[PDB]
Design a protein around this nucleic acid. Sequence first.
RNA 1: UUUU
RNA 2: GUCGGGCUCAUAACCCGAAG
RNA 3: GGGCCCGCACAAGCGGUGGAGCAUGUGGUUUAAUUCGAUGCAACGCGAAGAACCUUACCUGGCCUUGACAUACUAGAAACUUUCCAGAGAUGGAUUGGUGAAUCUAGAUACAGGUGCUGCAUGGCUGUCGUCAGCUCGUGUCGUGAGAUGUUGGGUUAAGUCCCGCAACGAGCGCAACCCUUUUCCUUACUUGCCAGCAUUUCGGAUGGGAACUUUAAGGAUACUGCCAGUGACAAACUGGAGGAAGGCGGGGACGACGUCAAGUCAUCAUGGCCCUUACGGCCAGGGCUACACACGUGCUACAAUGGUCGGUACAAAGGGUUGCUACACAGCGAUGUGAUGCUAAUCUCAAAAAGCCGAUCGUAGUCCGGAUUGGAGUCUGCAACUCGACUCCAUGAAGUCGGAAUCGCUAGUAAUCGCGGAUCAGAAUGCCGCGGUGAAUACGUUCCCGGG
Lengths: 117, 100, 83, 115, 210, 100, 127
Amino acid sequence: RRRVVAAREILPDPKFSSQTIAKFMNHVMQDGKKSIAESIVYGALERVQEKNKVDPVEFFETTLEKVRTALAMRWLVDAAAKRSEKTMALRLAGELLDAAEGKGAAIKKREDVHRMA
Amino acid sequence: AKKGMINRELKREKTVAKYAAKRAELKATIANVNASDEERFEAMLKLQALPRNASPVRLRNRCGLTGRPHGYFRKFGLSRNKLRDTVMQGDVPGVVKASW
Amino acid sequence: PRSLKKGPFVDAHLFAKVEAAVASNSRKPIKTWSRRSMILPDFVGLTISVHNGRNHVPVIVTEHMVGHKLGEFAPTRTYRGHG
Amino acid sequence: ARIAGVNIPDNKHAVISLTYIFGIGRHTAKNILAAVGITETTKIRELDDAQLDAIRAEVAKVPTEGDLRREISMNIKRLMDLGCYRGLRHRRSLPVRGQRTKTNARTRKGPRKPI
Amino acid sequence: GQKVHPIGIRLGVVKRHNANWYANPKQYAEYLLKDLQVREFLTKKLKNAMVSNILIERPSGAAKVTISTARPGIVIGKKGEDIEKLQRELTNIMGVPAQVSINEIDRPDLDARLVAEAIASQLEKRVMFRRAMKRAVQNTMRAGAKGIKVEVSGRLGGAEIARTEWYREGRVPLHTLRADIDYATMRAETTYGTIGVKVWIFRGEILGGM
Amino acid sequence: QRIRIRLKSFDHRLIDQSAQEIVETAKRTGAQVCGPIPMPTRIERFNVLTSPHVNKDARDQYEIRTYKRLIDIVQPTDKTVDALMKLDLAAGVDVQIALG
Amino acid sequence: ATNYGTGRRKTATARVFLSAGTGKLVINNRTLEQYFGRETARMVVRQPLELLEATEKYDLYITVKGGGIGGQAGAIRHGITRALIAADETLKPVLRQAGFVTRDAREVERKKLGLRKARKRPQFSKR
RNA sequence: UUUU
RNA sequence: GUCGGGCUCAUAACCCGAAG
RNA sequence: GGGCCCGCACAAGCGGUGGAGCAUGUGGUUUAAUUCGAUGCAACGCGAAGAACCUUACCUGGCCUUGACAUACUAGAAACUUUCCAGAGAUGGAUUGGUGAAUCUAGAUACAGGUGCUGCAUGGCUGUCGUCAGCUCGUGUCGUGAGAUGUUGGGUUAAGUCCCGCAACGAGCGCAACCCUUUUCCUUACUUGCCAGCAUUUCGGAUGGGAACUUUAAGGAUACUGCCAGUGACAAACUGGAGGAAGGCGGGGACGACGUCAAGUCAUCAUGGCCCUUACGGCCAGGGCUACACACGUGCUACAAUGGUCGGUACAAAGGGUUGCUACACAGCGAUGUGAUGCUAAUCUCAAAAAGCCGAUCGUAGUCCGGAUUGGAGUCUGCAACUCGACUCCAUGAAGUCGGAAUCGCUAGUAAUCGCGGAUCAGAAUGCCGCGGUGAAUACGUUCCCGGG
Ligand SMILES: C[NH+](C)c1cc(NC(=O)CNC(C)(C)C)c(O)c2c1C[C@H]1C[C@H]3[C@H]([NH+](C)C)C(O)=C(C(N)=O)C(=O)[C@@]3(O)C(O)=C1C2=O
Ligand SMILES: [Mg+2]
Ligand SMILES: [Mg+2]
Ligand SMILES: [Mg+2]
Ligand SMILES: [Mg+2]
Ligand SMILES: [Mg+2]
Ligand SMILES: [Mg+2]
Ligand SMILES: [Mg+2]
Ligand SMILES: [Mg+2]
Ligand SMILES: [Mg+2]
Ligand SMILES: [Mg+2]
Ligand SMILES: [Mg+2]
Ligand SMILES: [Mg+2]
Ligand SMILES: [Mg+2]
Ligand SMILES: [Mg+2]
Ligand SMILES: [Mg+2]
Ligand SMILES: [Mg+2]
Ligand SMILES: [Mg+2]
Ligand SMILES: [Mg+2]
Ligand SMILES: [Mg+2]
Ligand SMILES: [Mg+2]
Ligand SMILES: [Mg+2]
Ligand SMILES: [Mg+2]
Ligand SMILES: [Mg+2]
Ligand SMILES: [Mg+2]
């Protein structure tokens, strides 16, 4: 507060036990509807895995690096929204693939920040 | 309140006490299904022929000490103010300050 | 509205006056304080000086005015304009 | 395609395109496409003109654009002329069912006005 | 300011109620009001007596009132004409055959009720309120209680602006719920208006709940 | 024959003392008792505005709790129920007895 | 060969009966997927036994009343590890370092007198 | 930055 | 410039919006 | 006026309000009257835990005088009970059963009576600073004395909380604890509640039974730097980690010091005083508080797909119920109606939880979004729903495509969201108070903003 406080830990997601993707599905989550979030993000991962075969816990982590933590998640989740192609599980999965292939939608969305350097 | 109000409510509920069984049997006669309908019109007309102050719908509940009509409690028969000051001096059974 | 199984509502005083002035075909209007009695086909032609809080406004019970209460025909709030 | 004098949407379900006719909502369109026998899922684009005329006969048993609008404005006219409470309220563009007026009447009363 | 009433907060904690009955959830108010008039009348019938407490019991549909007073004489006098007719006078107000017993209050100086009684009986005697309060705290601390506050408020003896004065000698723990604290308030009806007497007396904590 | 005694009170220090006062009472001249089961308690709460005039937030929140207890006397003797009604029940506790 | 566990999380109770047998589950006379459509509730229902990597050496007959989806999932997992370390006490260290042993205390906080929602207070207004 |  | 809002315990300024 | 410190005070985040429709309170205006109170924080869903009549205090007319009700005095009659009419009603008339205390009537004198004024004459109660940490006393020391010290300084802490310093040493009221609740375990209690193990299973603890378990409600145990490491001044304290269900104040609630604001309230009540007494008192019926060019506050609902609709299937707690809730059956599209049933209740009922999950559907639009608004036809309460109720069905389908300056709440089972309940109450909750379901993000830091010691 005025003096000092710590941070809070979150229980790693029950599918892969990776804390980062759990923190990520805690970002699409809104109004306590964790089920919607879990369905959305697991669907995004199961879509990015079968095409572009990569271990998905390894995958999201090898793709967020070109986005930078929490700020990258916000940029993703909103850049994942302004697509209106199909269900949200799809415009997160296509956005993860766009970030992997080095697009401008999220891979170079923060480039305007590196442009400012 | 002004004593006219307490006398007015003693008045109204005294009436309701007077014409009670009459209003009850009339209300019963109306909802009858095995009765003639000339009667089911006579009963209506006679019921609404009563004093306005006959039907307890017109009453209002008031404090057992002051007579204050807002803030009433049917569990106690008093309004709010004298209720507070009686619960605190230890005059009521069961009531304490609540917390959970 | 009132429940159709309870029938329409009419007061006893006004209705006694209406039944006594139909047998006379009186032309004097009926001065009432009801405002709540429903307009019957009995009433057509007659004119009721019905209250409006301050005054009595006589309204002539016309044909399309059935199914209304008396008071519906006397605006109780005075409003002309603001400015 | 052309039912009761309106061009209902074509490439859409039948129960939902039947409601563009002023006088039909979901209940009445469901009643129509039940009494004729065409399921609501069927898109209008796939309708042979053997059923359009039956459903035309159906809407013809319904008060629709012209006559409905007419008798609507005619009842309000009876009210306006009968000089009763609600006719008065209709003359002034105020809420007539008994809604508050100190504020919160900008749909009957229009938008806000300055001094 | 804005303090809770002393007895009201230690009611389920360490104090007992001045009414001990049971009443079904639709016949409760009948009994309560039958009780309130009885208290209201007894507090005048025994006003120049020295009552400090009225306890009304309704055992199994009966009536038994116990008044804890200092002088059982003034409420009895000649034995055989008041307490057996006072039960007649109460039965008319409770509506149930009533009984009235006597609680001879030893140490007639531990009652905030009676300290307030004497203090206001002096105030309406047109006495100097400072000597009154302080004489009363002398009277009460000596008698064995371990703390006393006396509070007195409002147009004291007839000035035009109100003021409040208190005297605190000893120990009075109010935030301590296990503290046996007697508290009583009264109104001295002077010809100048109303003076409010409040009296807190302490005697030592309660150890053991109930 | 069964004797279901149900106790009610606004206080529990009274109901429990009366129950364990009567249970021993019977067990002295008999047997076949199933003890005072505790049945869930009713707790009704109140809010009382405390000021005379206008302070919506300032409220004393009160409670009142009615506690109920069960007591079974399965097959008591003929020298038991006599000593059962031959026992003075305090105030603040109500006892209702039903033969099954 | 019969061991019992009582697991409370929010308002749930989750009476768990664990026995040595096959890997089979019945949640209030209903199968694991017949009961929790949220297959993450099943994921944490299968947190403790799978952490011990057994998942086949015990049958579980469970009965839970109270709470919701997540409350009952956490309650069942709780009761399961209680039954578990009541069987093989030496297990408690491992189930301690992942958090499956601790009765989660957080209950819903009560509403307040004057407050919207128990810490939500009315929108403050000046002038 | 004006007023107590 | 005015009118409505914002700003202050209270004022203009200032900010906004609108009509003109 | 400085200095320090603190606190969703700012910061970071999350969500709102200001935009739009409506609900509600206020200002204004209006008006016969729109009754009065409450005006920064600390008035503005406020007194009011519920204005159709009643409440009701206001207006319009219509009526009354020892007065609707207290006692003090005089006379004839038991309280009473019917029945009708004039009347908008009050109000009056006219009739039947009954034959020293009472209960009306009649009269006169004091008197009653006012929600009339003054909260700036008062009490009694409340807000507020603010759960902010302070407020003192005794001795002993300093100051001719009032006074000071203590109670200051370094730290620390939620804290005049604790330690170390120190002419101070102690003590009290405040703080904390004692109180209630919630988390784990134990003893008792075993029905109405429970079903582990047996069997009977009409598949329903149902029914024998069992007293295990959940629960239920009484009596207790646990937690305290206790243990180890570290920083620290032979210190407090703080950082751990071990154990532990819980770790450091585990979580919440009640309790609100001395005082301030001539803060609020003569419309709860009481009271000194002033005013009225064919009315400023009492009683009626209709209106009104429900008005509407407008201005503000606080909310409810949405603008969409993390969604709408339709079908299938789960899982709460806490409350209420005899003038009441009503299993079930029959009728209706429904609100509901009729019969019918158990229940004074861990027994019967409200009662369906919703969001959730599964399947289809719509494909980014003023739309299958959103429901305002209006027309039409009803149901129930009620003596009556015009003014001025709630609900139900059909049609009707505005605004609104994330909102300016600005601004509010929040640090964890919380914000966010999803529904349930009650009090008041014949009927009338988006308000109040509660209940549970799902369930985040962030806190670098004290330079500033705001309140305080
Ligand atoms: C000085 N004047 C104006 C005054 C006079 C009286 N009393 C009288 O009229 C006379 N009293 C008699 C009957 C003669 C004994 C007064 O009674 C008052 C006041 C002042 C007001 C001021 C109020 C003020 N306003 C702006 C709300 C205010 O804010 C406060 C405050 N912040 O504390 C007040 O004190 C105030 O509300 C108030 O109480 C006043 C009076 O009491
Ligand atoms: Mg009065
Ligand atoms: Mg009423
Ligand atoms: Mg249409
Ligand atoms: Mg304390
Ligand atoms: Mg709770
Ligand atoms: Mg509020
Ligand atoms: Mg504001
Ligand atoms: Mg911030
Ligand atoms: Mg004032
Ligand atoms: Mg006279
Ligand atoms: Mg004052
Ligand atoms: Mg005062
Ligand atoms: Mg300090
Ligand atoms: Mg201290
Ligand atoms: Mg003042
Ligand atoms: Mg006065
Ligand atoms: Mg006044
Ligand atoms: Mg009236
Ligand atoms: Mg109002
Ligand atoms: Mg829709
Ligand atoms: Mg538009
Ligand atoms: Mg906090
Ligand atoms: Mg909640
Ligand atoms: Mg400051």
